[PDB]
Design a binder for this molecule. Structure first.
Ligand SMILES: *CC(=O)c1ccc(Br)cc1
Ligand SMILES: *CC(=O)c1ccc(Br)cc1
Lengths: 121, 121
């Protein structure tokens, strides 16, 4: 669930999840994928693509268990789907953290029209 | 879908859908419901409850058609679910507008933890 995601992002990035990635670029958004505007956006594209390859759980409403160990997001799941799902969020939270350096606030609330149709996952 | 919804909110509120309601309170967000922080937030709350009532379509992904006749959102869909959904979105856009007077920007990007568990719809 985006609950975990929100928590992860907040734990990694330390940034307000929605304020910074609730609507960023063409992929860090509620609706759809767009060809990435920058590294931060690519994270969400990858993440959204990560969700796509999922089968067996709802990437939005399926809560999974993970924990903060040695300041590391540790997925506490064996269910292949949740495990992966959790790994999707972790990878995105991390990625997002790793790309704060190039995070551009201009890409916030970036209108979907300025987005090109993203490649296929 | 969020597309129509957004559009409606724009049409009614005149405010940028994502900026003002993509993350406001405990309900105007991608998460679930939480005790509403104010009127605006209560709108979305109602609206999410509204979605729960839907069976036959996905409120998030499923797009639909509605007209904007005489500055009024006219749900054109004939399909029950989509019609219902549209009406749900119409109601929130309307409600949001009606409560624009007490819209408090300090609720934007409100953290979910800091959200009272919402009573079941
Ligand atoms: C999957 C992903 O990266 C993402 C980012 C932001 C929002 Br809002 C939803 C999903
Ligand atoms: C149902 C509703 O009001 C709502 C508001 C904002 C977002 Br993002 C999703 C849903």
């Amino acid at each position: 669930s985006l609950f975990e995601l929100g928590k992860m992002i907040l734990q990694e990035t330390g940034k307000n999840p929605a304020k910074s990635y609730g609507a960023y670029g063409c992929n860090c958004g509620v609706l759809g994928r767009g060809k990435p505007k920058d590294a931060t956006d690519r994270c969400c594209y990858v993440h959204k693509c990560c969700y796509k390859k999922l089968t067996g759980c709802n990437p939005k409403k399926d809560r999974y268990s993970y924990s903060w160990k040695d300041k590391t997001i540790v997925c506490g799941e064996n269910n292949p789907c949740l495990k992966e799902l959790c790994e999707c969020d972790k990878a995105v939270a991390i990625c997002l953290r790793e790309n704060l350096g190039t995070y551009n606030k201009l890409y916030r609330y970036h209108l979907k029209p300025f987005c090109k149709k993203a490649d296929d996952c």
